[PDB]
Fucose-binding lectin PA-IIL (Pseudomonas aeruginosa), 456 residues
Amino acid sequence: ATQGVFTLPANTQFGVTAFANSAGTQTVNVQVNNETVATFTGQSTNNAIIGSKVLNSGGGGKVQILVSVNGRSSDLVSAQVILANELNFALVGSEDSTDNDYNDAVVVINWPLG
Amino acid sequence: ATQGVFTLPANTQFGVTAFANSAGTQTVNVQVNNETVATFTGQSTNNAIIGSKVLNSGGGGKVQILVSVNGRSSDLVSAQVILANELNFALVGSEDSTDNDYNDAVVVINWPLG
Amino acid sequence: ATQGVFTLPANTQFGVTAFANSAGTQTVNVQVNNETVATFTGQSTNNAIIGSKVLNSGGGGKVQILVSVNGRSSDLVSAQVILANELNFALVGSEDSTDNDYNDAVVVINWPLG
Amino acid sequence: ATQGVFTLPANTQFGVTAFANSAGTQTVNVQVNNETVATFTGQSTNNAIIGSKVLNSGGGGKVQILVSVNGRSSDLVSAQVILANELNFALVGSEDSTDNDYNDAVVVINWPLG
Ligand SMILES: C[C@@H]1O[C@H](CNS(=O)(=O)c2ccc(/N=N/c3ccccc3)cc2)[C@@H](O)[C@H](O)[C@@H]1O
Ligand SMILES: C[C@@H]1O[C@H](CNS(=O)(=O)c2ccc(/N=N/c3ccccc3)cc2)[C@@H](O)[C@H](O)[C@@H]1O
Ligand SMILES: C[C@@H]1O[C@H](CNS(=O)(=O)c2ccc(/N=N/c3ccccc3)cc2)[C@@H](O)[C@H](O)[C@@H]1O
Ligand SMILES: C[C@@H]1O[C@H](CNS(=O)(=O)c2ccc(/N=N\c3ccccc3)cc2)[C@@H](O)[C@H](O)[C@@H]1O
Ligand SMILES: [Ca+2]
Ligand SMILES: [Ca+2]
Ligand SMILES: [Ca+2]
Ligand SMILES: [Ca+2]
Ligand SMILES: [Ca+2]
Ligand SMILES: [Ca+2]
Ligand SMILES: [Ca+2]
Ligand SMILES: [Ca+2]
Ligand SMILES: [Ca+2]
Ligand SMILES: [Ca+2]
């Protein structure tokens, strides 16, 4: 039911990177424990990286991605993958229109860092 | 060591189910916190279920799958996928020969239950 | 996003297995190229396998999982993951009520076989 | 190699993005149908992007990632995940030493683009 919400280990540094593939200017909001900590804005139809930041998951470890285009919330898809019981990817696609490529904004969260 | 080991939430019920797709008789050992708690043995080239059990992850939450054929450890491949930040799959494939279909024994761990 | 729909290679044997974790009796329908080829019905709150079958993907490769409880459609979550570029899992979780554990029927599709 | 090799749909544009999390300088080589078409070199312990390109998977679709540190091949872990039967991620972790964080170079391949 929930898409684009992930429970990270507490107080963990993570990377968050957003790609754009749409005619529409993407706005990507990163909320940690229900507070906006990063906003990425930009327009590309060729997978430009419109932001890449290192954030901290805080006490609650809650990380939510929200995507909007010209004030309209995009439909999200997401999952988390763990490799070798250690390397974590939290993955978000988003759809701003009708073609259902779900790539309009793509967000990759990765941890651990360092 | 780097594949077929999964850290589950402590004290959690989970399912483990093994399928066989090989000429060779598969043995799957399930260790929970470094103790063997279930063993599945069988032969099938048509995806037969050679065992399914509900176990508890215990204090440490450590679950390790070992696969061997005729006393020879198989090469493993594994990942964990989480859907909707809630539904967990720990997946193992194994290879007992040279064709690298990694389906000789296939193990699926799922939680939560109930 | 459509969920529970997977494009397989054409004319390929796969396995499909369903587990139940609900007070409600689950009915899982498997559609291959828009025709029902398997129906699994059962009831368990302890991960019982309510069905397992070997099918062929046919000419179009389209496999769709539908889940219902007492004739009412469950909400689905899904993803596909590929290990070692060869071993394929298509995963489905489903929700029949309000608790959002999405394990009420759990469906696992695996290929290749043999 | 059984890791870091992916069969993309033929003739498809994809993104490839590498991040570094190691004291050692990472060299990521991207081979498309067995030709090297990108080389990313850099050093970061804080998830800096050391490269990002848009490439075409060509007639055979084969994409391989190789990672080395001062001429020494790293151990790889990898998987592909598909959301909504449409949005694809091929994911690579690599380990250059003994701690098994598998984040020393992290490579994300995404498609479709546009
Ligand atoms: C089906 C295939 O089985 C493979 C493993 N086979 S194996 O264990 O080495 C093995 C075992 C017995 C064999 N022949 N036994 C005979 C033949 C004649 C008479 C008496 C005995 C040959 C091979 C998998 O790795 C593949 O993916 C694939 O599923
Ligand atoms: C043991 C528990 O069983 C639950 C299912 N219980 S159930 O009896 O079948 C059921 C209950 C309510 C349903 N819909 N109610 C409506 C529909 C419209 C309006 C108002 C209410 C459908 C089915 C699982 O969902 C849990 O996760 C858990 O496993
Ligand atoms: C900041 C840290 O940098 C590390 C790499 N540092 S390094 O200088 O390149 C390096 C590379 C290889 C080394 N030895 N490899 C062996 C030794 C014996 C047996 C097998 C392999 C030792 C040091 C990352 O691996 C960590 O995760 C972390 O990010
Ligand atoms: C490239 C494509 O961009 C799509 C989003 N497009 S959009 O931002 O809504 C948009 C649509 C129409 C626009 N303007 N004027 C028109 C257009 C036709 C007739 C008259 C006026 C301007 C912007 C993605 O959803 C796809 O996947 C894909 O990447
Ligand atoms: Ca949104
Ligand atoms: Ca949509
Ligand atoms: Ca779109
Ligand atoms: Ca698009
Ligand atoms: Ca084999
Ligand atoms: Ca086999
Ligand atoms: Ca439920
Ligand atoms: Ca349930
Ligand atoms: Ca390392
Ligand atoms: Ca590292």
Summary: Strands of chain A lie at 5-7, 13-20, 26-32, 35-42, 48-56, 62-69, 72-73, 75-83, 87-95, 105-111. The radius of gyration of chain A is 13 Å. The CA atoms of residues 8 and 22 of chain A lie 29 Å apart.
